[PDB]
Design a protein around this ligand. Sequence first.
Ligand SMILES: NC(=O)C1=CN([C@@H]2O[C@H](COP(=O)(O)OP(=O)(O)OC[C@H]3O[C@@H](n4cnc5c(N)ncnc54)[C@H](OP(=O)(O)O)[C@@H]3O)[C@@H](O)[C@H]2O)C=CC1
Ligand SMILES: NC(=O)C1=CN([C@@H]2O[C@H](COP(=O)(O)OP(=O)(O)OC[C@H]3O[C@@H](n4cnc5c(N)ncnc54)[C@H](OP(=O)(O)O)[C@@H]3O)[C@@H](O)[C@H]2O)C=CC1
Ligand SMILES: NC(=O)C1=CN([C@@H]2O[C@H](COP(=O)(O)OP(=O)(O)OC[C@H]3O[C@@H](n4cnc5c(N)ncnc54)[C@H](OP(=O)(O)O)[C@@H]3O)[C@@H](O)[C@H]2O)C=CC1
Ligand SMILES: Nc1nc2c(ncn2[C@@H]2O[C@H](COP(=O)(O)OP(=O)(O)OP(=O)(O)O)[C@@H](O)[C@H]2O)c(=O)[nH]1
Ligand SMILES: Nc1nc2c(ncn2[C@@H]2O[C@H](COP(=O)(O)OP(=O)(O)OP(=O)(O)O)[C@@H](O)[C@H]2O)c(=O)[nH]1
Ligand SMILES: Nc1nc2c(ncn2[C@@H]2O[C@H](COP(=O)(O)OP(=O)(O)OP(=O)(O)O)[C@@H](O)[C@H]2O)c(=O)[nH]1
Ligand SMILES: Oc1c(Cl)cc(Cl)c(Cl)c1Cc1c(O)c(Cl)cc(Cl)c1Cl
Ligand SMILES: Oc1c(Cl)cc(Cl)c(Cl)c1Cc1c(O)c(Cl)cc(Cl)c1Cl
Ligand SMILES: Oc1c(Cl)cc(Cl)c(Cl)c1Cc1c(O)c(Cl)cc(Cl)c1Cl
Lengths: 495, 495, 495
Amino acid sequence: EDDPNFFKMVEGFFDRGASIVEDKLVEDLKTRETEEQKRNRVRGILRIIKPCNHVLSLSFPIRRDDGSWEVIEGYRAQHSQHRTPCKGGIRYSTDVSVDEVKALASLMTYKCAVVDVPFGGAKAGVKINPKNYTDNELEKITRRFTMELAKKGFIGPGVDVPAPDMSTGEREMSWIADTYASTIGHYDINAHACVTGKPISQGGIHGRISATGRGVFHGIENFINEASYMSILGMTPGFGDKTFAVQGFGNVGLHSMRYLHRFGAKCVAVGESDGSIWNPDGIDPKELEDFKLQHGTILGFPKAKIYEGSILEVDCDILIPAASEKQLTKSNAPRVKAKIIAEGANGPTTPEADKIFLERNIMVIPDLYLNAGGVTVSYFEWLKNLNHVSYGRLTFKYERDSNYHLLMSVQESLERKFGKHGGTIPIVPTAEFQDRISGASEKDIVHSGLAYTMERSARQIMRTAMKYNLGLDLRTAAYVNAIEKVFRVYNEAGV
Amino acid sequence: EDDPNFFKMVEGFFDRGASIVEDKLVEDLKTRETEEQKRNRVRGILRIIKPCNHVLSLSFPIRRDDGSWEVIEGYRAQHSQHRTPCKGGIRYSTDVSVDEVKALASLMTYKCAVVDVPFGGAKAGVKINPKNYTDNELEKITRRFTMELAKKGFIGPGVDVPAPDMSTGEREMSWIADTYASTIGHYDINAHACVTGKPISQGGIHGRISATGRGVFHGIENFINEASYMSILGMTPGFGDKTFAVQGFGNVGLHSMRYLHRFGAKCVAVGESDGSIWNPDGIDPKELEDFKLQHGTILGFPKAKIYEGSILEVDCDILIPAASEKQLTKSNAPRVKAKIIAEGANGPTTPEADKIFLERNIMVIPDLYLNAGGVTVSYFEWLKNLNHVSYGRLTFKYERDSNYHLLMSVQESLERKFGKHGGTIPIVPTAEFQDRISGASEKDIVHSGLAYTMERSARQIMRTAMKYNLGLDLRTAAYVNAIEKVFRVYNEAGV
Amino acid sequence: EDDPNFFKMVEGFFDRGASIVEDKLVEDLKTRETEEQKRNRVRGILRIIKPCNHVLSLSFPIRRDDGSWEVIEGYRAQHSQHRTPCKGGIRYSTDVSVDEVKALASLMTYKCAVVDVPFGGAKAGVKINPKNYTDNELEKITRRFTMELAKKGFIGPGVDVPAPDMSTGEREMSWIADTYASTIGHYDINAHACVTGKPISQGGIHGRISATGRGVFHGIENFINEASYMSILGMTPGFGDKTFAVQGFGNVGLHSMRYLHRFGAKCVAVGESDGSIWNPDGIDPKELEDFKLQHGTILGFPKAKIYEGSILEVDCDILIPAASEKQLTKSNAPRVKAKIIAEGANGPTTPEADKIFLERNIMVIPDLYLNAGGVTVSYFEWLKNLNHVSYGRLTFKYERDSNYHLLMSVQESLERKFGKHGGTIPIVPTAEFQDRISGASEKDIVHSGLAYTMERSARQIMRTAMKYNLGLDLRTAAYVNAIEKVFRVYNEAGV
Ligand SMILES: NC(=O)C1=CN([C@@H]2O[C@H](COP(=O)(O)OP(=O)(O)OC[C@H]3O[C@@H](n4cnc5c(N)ncnc54)[C@H](OP(=O)(O)O)[C@@H]3O)[C@@H](O)[C@H]2O)C=CC1
Ligand SMILES: NC(=O)C1=CN([C@@H]2O[C@H](COP(=O)(O)OP(=O)(O)OC[C@H]3O[C@@H](n4cnc5c(N)ncnc54)[C@H](OP(=O)(O)O)[C@@H]3O)[C@@H](O)[C@H]2O)C=CC1
Ligand SMILES: NC(=O)C1=CN([C@@H]2O[C@H](COP(=O)(O)OP(=O)(O)OC[C@H]3O[C@@H](n4cnc5c(N)ncnc54)[C@H](OP(=O)(O)O)[C@@H]3O)[C@@H](O)[C@H]2O)C=CC1
Ligand SMILES: Nc1nc2c(ncn2[C@@H]2O[C@H](COP(=O)(O)OP(=O)(O)OP(=O)(O)O)[C@@H](O)[C@H]2O)c(=O)[nH]1
Ligand SMILES: Nc1nc2c(ncn2[C@@H]2O[C@H](COP(=O)(O)OP(=O)(O)OP(=O)(O)O)[C@@H](O)[C@H]2O)c(=O)[nH]1
Ligand SMILES: Nc1nc2c(ncn2[C@@H]2O[C@H](COP(=O)(O)OP(=O)(O)OP(=O)(O)O)[C@@H](O)[C@H]2O)c(=O)[nH]1
Ligand SMILES: Oc1c(Cl)cc(Cl)c(Cl)c1Cc1c(O)c(Cl)cc(Cl)c1Cl
Ligand SMILES: Oc1c(Cl)cc(Cl)c(Cl)c1Cc1c(O)c(Cl)cc(Cl)c1Cl
Ligand SMILES: Oc1c(Cl)cc(Cl)c(Cl)c1Cc1c(O)c(Cl)cc(Cl)c1Cl
């Protein structure tokens, strides 16, 4: 009950936001036939943006360990190409259908527009349940899948760059890169930039794994510290006195929990497919993770009870959906308790849940902004691959020396003016500037680059929510920017 | 009522035929684990054949003559690649969906297996009604469509070679070739072999337009002259005393009517979308065509009345469906009158109509054989393009001389043995051998090559219908061969 | 008269400068056969530099809006490739001939040598009068032109990178990039680096439009502030008391006027093809531009009279030719009034006008230096495209933090030495260092990079004019450096 066509579901958000700005897009336009044919031409460009450009559907055979033949299905969709290459991960699930992949792909592009990553949207899906395949079988699958994508122009450094999503980690990325760089890209100087989310030894970048969590953190942080928004929710600014619950203890889930906890937030609930756990006094990220690693499940965790009932309904301040889509529907929407909904996963709530949450006066930080930390960091990995140099190497020593001389320049100058009367005036770095004395390292850029991006995009949305009184409809605010940016292109290039 | 999903409908025919042969495919197999794991491996290979390998879905913009923006959808599916390149036409219709294109694509491959054309199956569709677009708009569409196909490996001399289908003629093929050879294939020595059904001046081959009609003729001819099959129908062999009716006065329809009429068959009905016409005394192909060209419709034709009622039900000997799919369904099936059903179009009858026709004892010459004359000739065009010489050029003079000497060798020899007593014994060619004195021409090869193929494939099917007592279930007989052939490749190819 | 072959005209400047340095190029040379065969080998290398390497001549058809067929001609020349790729704009005019394109191409390479941009010279021309073609027809032309260039290796990220010139702006560049990245470069990770001067939304860079004007400004600034040169002209250093007149109110014209005016210079005349305008009290850049945009011409401008007579002869301090070539010839040369000639356009003055201006003691700042600001900025755009990151993104936050700590390091140190006695010694940034606290942004690098380059190259020329007493023959000084740099390269290469 309340199950909408994910693709159209996203189109819904797009159209809603399209209207809001349609007027501006016509005013800025300065063409000759100034008459409202301008208004049609804008609507024409919009009708062009909405649909995917290329969608590849695969069906290929693999040989099961038991010697039998099985046909596996997979898809890869390229939504837009107003920016090259396309970006978007690969989800391994039995729920993948073209409609889903087409939707996630489109979310990737608007996602990038919000966060200013120069990539068009894309997304992949292989209809399998990894839990029923041996490691050996999976590898054969992801490798062969890379090939059939390659052969048709659906993966490449300047075409389409995959990344992780559901049930795919750096292990999968690692095989993808290897297959590509060993075959199609044997001569490509940018071969390893054909995919992101790779192991660091494979050319991955620091913190891409925890990237999304760290991003989710910044997303919330930017909003839970506004008052303008916190008042409307009857909430005190700051994390120190908040309790949250998260659906999905995975890449985006685990790390989301990790960072919030790090800033005095309390995890009162954690969920999965098998069940949810709870504890009003709070659950710890590190022991839960080790229990989960050792036992392969969160159910049974000693310092917490096996909560019976919807993880999406538990009593808390912030609800973090980090599982699959449409978890928050029209049904359960009214029974959420939480004041803040930080959309960790892509499209975890239906259009109607939004509607209800708006009325219920519960703030929903949209997915296409809140979870954009993943690509922001993937983009940094991609730049790293192109550069072929790890940040800081060429300059670590030069800056260090240069910095000590800068500091020595004020010292010797002051000793000159205040003579022997002041004796020596030692100018040493503080503990903080000491940690920076050489300049930024790879770790430093990811951390601050992400932060700069999450913060900067937050303001861009807030600023918009104001200019159009969307109040707590941040999702619409977010799409306005995406459209506003993606449009400025298609317009300025003869479509 | 009864209009199943097209793709599975064809899968239906495949499975049915799969069973019939499954046994043979296991007997011929000579592997080590001779136990019936052999039977699973065969079923495994079959599960692999059935689905399409690659399906590209396009969505791109074109600029309407009135200056507006419209998004047009198109698809191209590559069913199999056990043979390279893929082959199959492009249909321009508003009824094209992936399911349809996926179906037609699969029919192309089995079609080729029956007729022995070394191509894997493929098919394209662009969701538009050509009748609502100017010539200028169409060209923009077909050209841009060729590009988006090219960019993703869905058109190329050794990859996928398109051809005509519904609402696409040599005009469209001509633009396709031009776009390709002018861009992607500028350096390809086989650039113009990227598509068939081209204008002869564009590298087309003689008779490709009337190819399918001529083929349909041969298909019927091979069966309407067996007695073995004609007896079971209570019909005298030969065309001389037969009356037929055809649904669709198009490329496959018009020419089908043309050739049958040429051999003393009488066209009593012709149909279209607007309506059907009739005349028990027979309608003439040439005057109907000129009326149709001059007036843009068959309705109103002077030497015939405007028949009210289903063209598929009119009283005649042979019913030729040359329109779209599923015309003959479970409903109207029982009211057909005709004894012979020559499937001109692809899949014009549902699985149940078959069933009824079997019982009703009405012979149905399957589409995947009867209309294979098109690709057989397309294949000849493709070979012509690769050869870069039209049949006969290099040898016309040599054979002519060589032949006159061969004939002169018996002459001078006989004059030698019978001396002056017999005087001169002139050895001149007959009128027939004179027409061949130089050897086969492009026209000659198409005509006899087609004939050789239609006939040879007919026997292959008949021969099969006997070995498995399918009697009048020729469709199943046809699929048995297709499967039987497509199989061997995969078996010993490394699957 | 005085209408020489634009190509030889430039060759003239080259030979003249060739001689001046020939001696040095032989002295530095340290080969075995030290005898003056060295002097032949240098002359041999020079005979090799002078001519273009590849010149493509195009002739292709376009379809006029009124349905008719017209053949359009175009050329693209690649002068040198001692540096890859080639660089140089596209001029849309009816005056384009191979000789012109070959000339402008050669000016591009020496232009780059003076300014240190690692590109060999190139240039294009399409023989049409844009003023007689609709926007729709132009686009068809520029797109099809990009294709015919592509097909033959005359456009590509690492081959030949076009840019704007006469009657071509970012609109044309935008279509060029689009056609390339959508076809030939669909897989190129550097596809959008196939051309510069693109809209910013298309990957353009900040200030490339006003780049040349800004450059022209710096060019003059570096010379109008030397005294060494200002004395010889009987002129006070500085812009504050100068009046200039410019021929051509276009990309290079308008912005040239803009920047000079910004620094207290007074525009007393502005010209075009239809006519010139004047005002001894000065004309304003902003109102003239708006009049020109609204009315499509400068003639009629309220705050100025319609000057009857040559714009190249008006009374002023500095004459800025920003129109086509050979405007200042032997004829009108003696009647110029201005003391300074800032060659904005490429080769606006004939070899003899030079001669006269030398005698007349009028300083001519050579085109191949003065207007090099365009490529310098185009080069920055190209680097931007390769980098796939806009300057500053990765480091904005890190530097800002790092800087506050640097400043905090002196603060905490001083508070330590001067204890409570000095209380807090707050170390805050000035307004200027505040504007830089995060580091350079894209805007910052273009502006200072251009300045660094214009200034540095000015000194290189002055320094040379001295070592060879060319006094006011800066053109010859400029070519000496170009040759001196390019030669070295063909030298050490294996030729
Ligand atoms: N790098 C990334 O992976 C990124 C992902 N995202 C977003 O987050 C989501 C991806 O999470 P990833 O795929 O990152 O998570 P990972 O697969 O690790 O998440 C694993 C967890 O998800 C739980 N889970 C799955 N389905 C449900 C469900 N219906 N209800 C409750 N729990 C469930 C699993 O339980 P079980 O194991 O029993 O299924 C498991 O504990 C995507 O939708 C995407 O939009 C965004 C940016 C980065
Ligand atoms: N080279 C080829 O074209 C080949 C074609 N074929 C087969 O023939 C069919 C292709 O026909 P082409 O595409 O050759 O035909 P063309 O478009 O000429 O066929 C035109 C005729 O089809 C009629 N028609 C369309 N829809 C219907 C309908 N729903 N009911 C009755 N009549 C209808 C049209 O009426 P109207 O004009 O008013 O729309 C017109 O008279 C395919 O299905 C294919 O399997 C097989 C091999 C080769
Ligand atoms: N990136 C760049 O664009 C660079 C440009 N340059 C130089 O500047 C020149 C380019 O100018 P752009 O092409 O920038 O100028 P744009 O075409 O805008 O210049 C337009 C102006 O040129 C005037 N004009 C053209 N021909 C004549 C003529 N015969 N007599 C008088 N006025 C004339 C036009 O008048 P009207 O409109 O009535 O024809 C118009 O006002 C080039 O030759 C180039 O070497 C230098 C460096 C880089
Ligand atoms: N998968 C996973 N890795 C973790 C986790 N916590 C820490 N890591 C580690 O991240 C490590 C390197 O971290 P760098 O300092 O050394 O980590 P960091 O940037 O300070 O981590 P954050 O403070 O969360 O941003 C790796 O060696 C991982 O073991 C976790 O909860 N899950
Ligand atoms: N539409 C149509 N085309 C025809 C017909 N007859 C011949 N053609 C043409 O086939 C032409 C050249 O044909 P020929 O070499 O004379 O044909 P043919 O071998 O005698 O034709 P069949 O007799 O093989 O059809 C092409 O230009 C077609 O237009 C016809 O009755 N209808
Ligand atoms: N390119 C251009 N821009 C103009 C002109 N006149 C006004 N503008 C304004 O340029 C504005 C943005 O200017 P900026 O990019 O910040 O200018 P800038 O690079 O600091 O300008 P300069 O310091 O002269 O190079 C827009 O909002 C326009 O309204 C003109 O003649 N040419
Ligand atoms: O140039 C390539 C490469 Cl190296 C890989 C792929 Cl998948 C594609 Cl498609 C191309 C471009 C290309 C080709 O290289 C060839 Cl020989 C044929 C085609 Cl129809 C196309 Cl479009
Ligand atoms: O060359 C390519 C590349 Cl490298 C990518 C793509 Cl997608 C396409 Cl379509 C082409 C085909 C192509 C072209 O698009 C053009 Cl204009 C010229 C050539 Cl001689 C070639 Cl071979
Ligand atoms: O790719 C070719 C081919 Cl097949 C032939 C030639 Cl004579 C050349 Cl020199 C190339 C190099 C080349 C290319 O590799 C691409 Cl992609 C485009 C272009 Cl216009 C060109 Cl000239």
